[PDB]
PDB file of all heavy atoms in Angstrom:
ATOM      1  N   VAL A  43       4.461   3.001  -6.955  1.00 50.37           N
ATOM      2  CA  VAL A  43       3.219   2.201  -7.011  1.00 50.37           C
ATOM      3  C   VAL A  43       2.119   3.239  -7.074  1.00 50.37           C
ATOM      4  O   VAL A  43       1.847   3.899  -6.075  1.00 50.37           O
ATOM      5  CB  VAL A  43       3.077   1.298  -5.761  1.00 50.37           C
ATOM      6  CG1 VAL A  43       1.799   0.483  -5.832  1.00 50.37           C
ATOM      7  CG2 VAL A  43       4.299   0.368  -5.616  1.00 50.37           C
ATOM      8  N   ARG A  44       1.493   3.372  -8.258  1.00 54.49           N
ATOM      9  CA  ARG A  44       0.647   4.539  -8.540  1.00 54.49           C
ATOM     10  C   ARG A  44      -0.778   4.095  -8.673  1.00 54.49           C
ATOM     11  O   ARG A  44      -1.088   3.134  -9.285  1.00 54.49           O
ATOM     12  CB  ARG A  44       1.135   5.247  -9.775  1.00 54.49           C
ATOM     13  CG  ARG A  44       2.622   5.604  -9.755  1.00 54.49           C
ATOM     14  CD  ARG A  44       2.976   6.436 -10.926  1.00 54.49           C
ATOM     15  NE  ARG A  44       4.388   6.729 -10.913  1.00 54.49           N
ATOM     16  CZ  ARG A  44       4.966   7.783 -11.462  1.00 54.49           C
ATOM     17  NH1 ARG A  44       4.244   8.743 -11.952  1.00 54.49           N
ATOM     18  NH2 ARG A  44       6.283   7.928 -11.422  1.00 54.49           N
ATOM     19  N   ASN A  45      -1.731   4.815  -8.034  1.00 55.74           N
ATOM     20  CA  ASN A  45      -3.101   4.387  -8.091  1.00 55.74           C
ATOM     21  C   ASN A  45      -3.561   4.526  -9.536  1.00 55.74           C
ATOM     22  O   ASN A  45      -3.339   5.574 -10.156  1.00 55.74           O
ATOM     23  CB  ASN A  45      -3.980   5.238  -7.182  1.00 55.74           C
ATOM     24  CG  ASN A  45      -5.361   4.692  -7.039  1.00 55.74           C
ATOM     25  OD1 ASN A  45      -6.293   5.181  -7.696  1.00 55.74           O
ATOM     26  ND2 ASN A  45      -5.504   3.642  -6.208  1.00 55.74           N
ATOM     27  N   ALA A  46      -4.260   3.545 -10.038  1.00 56.87           N
ATOM     28  CA  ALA A  46      -4.680   3.550 -11.425  1.00 56.87           C
ATOM     29  C   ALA A  46      -5.712   4.619 -11.669  1.00 56.87           C
ATOM     30  O   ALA A  46      -5.752   5.221 -12.806  1.00 56.87           O
ATOM     31  CB  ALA A  46      -5.166   2.167 -11.842  1.00 56.87           C
ATOM     32  N   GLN A  47      -6.567   4.923 -10.702  1.00 59.15           N
ATOM     33  CA  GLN A  47      -7.591   5.914 -10.854  1.00 59.15           C
ATOM     34  C   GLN A  47      -7.005   7.315 -10.638  1.00 59.15           C
ATOM     35  O   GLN A  47      -7.181   8.230 -11.488  1.00 59.15           O
ATOM     36  CB  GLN A  47      -8.774   5.678  -9.958  1.00 59.15           C
ATOM     37  CG  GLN A  47      -9.852   6.754 -10.017  1.00 59.15           C
ATOM     38  CD  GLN A  47     -10.551   6.789 -11.320  1.00 59.15           C
ATOM     39  OE1 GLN A  47     -10.797   5.737 -11.955  1.00 59.15           O
ATOM     40  NE2 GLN A  47     -10.906   7.994 -11.765  1.00 59.15           N
ATOM     41  N   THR A  48      -6.329   7.551  -9.520  1.00 56.70           N
ATOM     42  CA  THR A  48      -5.945   8.906  -9.102  1.00 56.70           C
ATOM     43  C   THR A  48      -4.585   9.303  -9.619  1.00 56.70           C
ATOM     44  O   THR A  48      -4.289  10.470  -9.520  1.00 56.70           O
ATOM     45  CB  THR A  48      -5.949   9.059  -7.555  1.00 56.70           C
ATOM     46  OG1 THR A  48      -4.824   8.348  -6.982  1.00 56.70           O
ATOM     47  CG2 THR A  48      -7.261   8.627  -6.870  1.00 56.70           C
ATOM     48  N   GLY A  49      -3.758   8.342 -10.035  1.00 57.32           N
ATOM     49  CA  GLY A  49      -2.390   8.619 -10.475  1.00 57.32           C
ATOM     50  C   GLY A  49      -1.450   9.034  -9.386  1.00 57.32           C
ATOM     51  O   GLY A  49      -0.281   9.350  -9.649  1.00 57.32           O
ATOM     52  N   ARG A  50      -1.888   8.960  -8.105  1.00 56.87           N
ATOM     53  CA  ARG A  50      -1.107   9.394  -6.950  1.00 56.87           C
ATOM     54  C   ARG A  50      -0.191   8.202  -6.498  1.00 56.87           C
ATOM     55  O   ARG A  50      -0.575   7.015  -6.648  1.00 56.87           O
ATOM     56  CB  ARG A  50      -1.985   9.844  -5.792  1.00 56.87           C
ATOM     57  CG  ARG A  50      -2.768  11.151  -6.139  1.00 56.87           C
ATOM     58  CD  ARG A  50      -3.872  11.330  -5.125  1.00 56.87           C
ATOM     59  NE  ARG A  50      -3.393  11.742  -3.831  1.00 56.87           N
ATOM     60  CZ  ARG A  50      -3.301  12.966  -3.370  1.00 56.87           C
ATOM     61  NH1 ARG A  50      -3.650  13.980  -4.185  1.00 56.87           N
ATOM     62  NH2 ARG A  50      -2.855  13.209  -2.146  1.00 56.87           N
ATOM     63  N   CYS A  51       0.954   8.486  -5.963  1.00 58.34           N
ATOM     64  CA  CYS A  51       1.902   7.461  -5.478  1.00 58.34           C
ATOM     65  C   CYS A  51       1.620   6.999  -4.059  1.00 58.34           C
ATOM     66  O   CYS A  51       1.527   7.833  -3.167  1.00 58.34           O
ATOM     67  CB  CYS A  51       3.357   8.076  -5.463  1.00 58.34           C
ATOM     68  SG  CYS A  51       4.195   7.884  -7.111  1.00 58.34           S
ATOM     69  N   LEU A  52       1.658   5.715  -3.876  1.00 55.43           N
ATOM     70  CA  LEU A  52       1.765   5.094  -2.566  1.00 55.43           C
ATOM     71  C   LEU A  52       2.945   5.561  -1.846  1.00 55.43           C
ATOM     72  O   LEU A  52       4.037   5.617  -2.415  1.00 55.43           O
ATOM     73  CB  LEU A  52       1.715   3.616  -2.685  1.00 55.43           C
ATOM     74  CG  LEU A  52       1.606   2.819  -1.416  1.00 55.43           C
ATOM     75  CD1 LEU A  52       0.234   3.008  -0.777  1.00 55.43           C
ATOM     76  CD2 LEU A  52       1.929   1.357  -1.660  1.00 55.43           C
ATOM     77  N   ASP A  53       2.765   5.970  -0.600  1.00 53.86           N
ATOM     78  CA  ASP A  53       3.756   6.721   0.170  1.00 53.86           C
ATOM     79  C   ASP A  53       3.656   6.336   1.644  1.00 53.86           C
ATOM     80  O   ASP A  53       2.590   5.948   2.084  1.00 53.86           O
ATOM     81  CB  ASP A  53       3.503   8.229  -0.120  1.00 53.86           C
ATOM     82  CG  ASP A  53       4.659   9.137   0.189  1.00 53.86           C
ATOM     83  OD1 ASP A  53       5.671   8.751   0.819  1.00 53.86           O
ATOM     84  OD2 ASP A  53       4.549  10.322  -0.306  1.00 53.86           O
ATOM     85  N   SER A  54       4.738   6.496   2.386  1.00 52.85           N
ATOM     86  CA  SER A  54       4.687   6.220   3.801  1.00 52.85           C
ATOM     87  C   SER A  54       5.782   6.935   4.474  1.00 52.85           C
ATOM     88  O   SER A  54       6.738   7.383   3.840  1.00 52.85           O
ATOM     89  CB  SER A  54       4.738   4.725   4.059  1.00 52.85           C
ATOM     90  OG  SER A  54       6.002   4.197   3.859  1.00 52.85           O
ATOM     91  N   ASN A  55       5.740   6.962   5.826  1.00 54.07           N
ATOM     92  CA  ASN A  55       6.752   7.688   6.595  1.00 54.07           C
ATOM     93  C   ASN A  55       7.338   6.828   7.717  1.00 54.07           C
ATOM     94  O   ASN A  55       6.978   5.657   7.879  1.00 54.07           O
ATOM     95  CB  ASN A  55       6.216   9.027   7.156  1.00 54.07           C
ATOM     96  CG  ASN A  55       5.138   8.815   8.193  1.00 54.07           C
ATOM     97  OD1 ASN A  55       4.969   7.765   8.741  1.00 54.07           O
ATOM     98  ND2 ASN A  55       4.328   9.840   8.397  1.00 54.07           N
ATOM     99  N   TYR A  56       8.364   7.320   8.393  1.00 50.78           N
ATOM    100  CA  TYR A  56       9.081   6.554   9.417  1.00 50.78           C
ATOM    101  C   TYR A  56       8.177   6.141  10.556  1.00 50.78           C
ATOM    102  O   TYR A  56       8.396   5.099  11.193  1.00 50.78           O
ATOM    103  CB  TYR A  56      10.332   7.278   9.928  1.00 50.78           C
ATOM    104  CG  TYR A  56      11.560   7.073   9.038  1.00 50.78           C
ATOM    105  CD1 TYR A  56      11.893   8.004   8.090  1.00 50.78           C
ATOM    106  CD2 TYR A  56      12.372   5.979   9.177  1.00 50.78           C
ATOM    107  CE1 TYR A  56      12.990   7.888   7.312  1.00 50.78           C
ATOM    108  CE2 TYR A  56      13.478   5.828   8.396  1.00 50.78           C
ATOM    109  CZ  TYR A  56      13.817   6.797   7.470  1.00 50.78           C
ATOM    110  OH  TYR A  56      14.935   6.625   6.673  1.00 50.78           O
ATOM    111  N   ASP A  57       7.142   6.940  10.839  1.00 52.26           N
ATOM    112  CA  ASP A  57       6.156   6.618  11.907  1.00 52.26           C
ATOM    113  C   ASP A  57       5.170   5.570  11.553  1.00 52.26           C
ATOM    114  O   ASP A  57       4.448   5.084  12.427  1.00 52.26           O
ATOM    115  CB  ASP A  57       5.449   7.956  12.247  1.00 52.26           C
ATOM    116  CG  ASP A  57       4.347   7.839  13.283  1.00 52.26           C
ATOM    117  OD1 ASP A  57       4.677   7.476  14.435  1.00 52.26           O
ATOM    118  OD2 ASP A  57       3.226   8.106  12.903  1.00 52.26           O
ATOM    119  N   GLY A  58       5.141   5.178  10.257  1.00 50.41           N
ATOM    120  CA  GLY A  58       4.241   4.113   9.821  1.00 50.41           C
ATOM    121  C   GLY A  58       2.937   4.519   9.167  1.00 50.41           C
ATOM    122  O   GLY A  58       2.124   3.660   8.845  1.00 50.41           O
ATOM    123  N   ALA A  59       2.661   5.813   8.973  1.00 52.62           N
ATOM    124  CA  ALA A  59       1.515   6.252   8.246  1.00 52.62           C
ATOM    125  C   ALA A  59       1.704   5.945   6.737  1.00 52.62           C
ATOM    126  O   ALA A  59       2.847   6.008   6.226  1.00 52.62           O
ATOM    127  CB  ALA A  59       1.291   7.752   8.407  1.00 52.62           C
ATOM    128  N   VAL A  60       0.603   5.594   6.126  1.00 51.43           N
ATOM    129  CA  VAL A  60       0.473   5.297   4.718  1.00 51.43           C
ATOM    130  C   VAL A  60      -0.561   6.221   4.081  1.00 51.43           C
ATOM    131  O   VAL A  60      -1.673   6.383   4.656  1.00 51.43           O
ATOM    132  CB  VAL A  60       0.222   3.797   4.406  1.00 51.43           C
ATOM    133  CG1 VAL A  60       0.056   3.591   2.921  1.00 51.43           C
ATOM    134  CG2 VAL A  60       1.352   2.959   4.969  1.00 51.43           C
ATOM    135  N   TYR A  61      -0.304   6.728   2.879  1.00 56.11           N
ATOM    136  CA  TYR A  61      -1.139   7.687   2.189  1.00 56.11           C
ATOM    137  C   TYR A  61      -0.713   7.691   0.713  1.00 56.11           C
ATOM    138  O   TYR A  61       0.265   7.011   0.336  1.00 56.11           O
ATOM    139  CB  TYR A  61      -1.034   9.078   2.853  1.00 56.11           C
ATOM    140  CG  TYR A  61       0.374   9.419   3.279  1.00 56.11           C
ATOM    141  CD1 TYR A  61       1.309   9.983   2.384  1.00 56.11           C
ATOM    142  CD2 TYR A  61       0.844   9.083   4.509  1.00 56.11           C
ATOM    143  CE1 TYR A  61       2.594  10.245   2.726  1.00 56.11           C
ATOM    144  CE2 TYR A  61       2.113   9.374   4.922  1.00 56.11           C
ATOM    145  CZ  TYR A  61       3.064   9.932   3.983  1.00 56.11           C
ATOM    146  OH  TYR A  61       4.376  10.125   4.342  1.00 56.11           O
ATOM    147  N   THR A  62      -1.417   8.404  -0.131  1.00 58.13           N
ATOM    148  CA  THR A  62      -0.931   8.758  -1.460  1.00 58.13           C
ATOM    149  C   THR A  62      -0.769  10.242  -1.609  1.00 58.13           C
ATOM    150  O   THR A  62      -1.529  10.983  -1.037  1.00 58.13           O
ATOM    151  CB  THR A  62      -1.782   8.248  -2.582  1.00 58.13           C
ATOM    152  OG1 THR A  62      -3.043   9.010  -2.670  1.00 58.13           O
ATOM    153  CG2 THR A  62      -2.097   6.775  -2.476  1.00 58.13           C
ATOM    154  N   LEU A  63       0.228  10.601  -2.418  1.00 56.78           N
ATOM    155  CA  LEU A  63       0.548  12.002  -2.725  1.00 56.78           C
ATOM    156  C   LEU A  63       0.869  12.050  -4.204  1.00 56.78           C
ATOM    157  O   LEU A  63       1.283  11.045  -4.764  1.00 56.78           O
ATOM    158  CB  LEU A  63       1.726  12.481  -1.955  1.00 56.78           C
ATOM    159  CG  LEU A  63       1.445  12.872  -0.507  1.00 56.78           C
ATOM    160  CD1 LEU A  63       2.710  13.235   0.147  1.00 56.78           C
ATOM    161  CD2 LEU A  63       0.447  14.034  -0.329  1.00 56.78           C
TER     162      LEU A  63
END
Side-chain angles (χ1 to χ4, degrees):
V43 180
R44 307 187 182 206
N45 189 260
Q47 176 68 36
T48 72
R50 293 165 73 95
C51 273
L52 189 70
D53 199 350
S54 74
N55 66 17
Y56 277 96
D57 177 64
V60 178
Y61 40 85
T62 73
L63 281 176

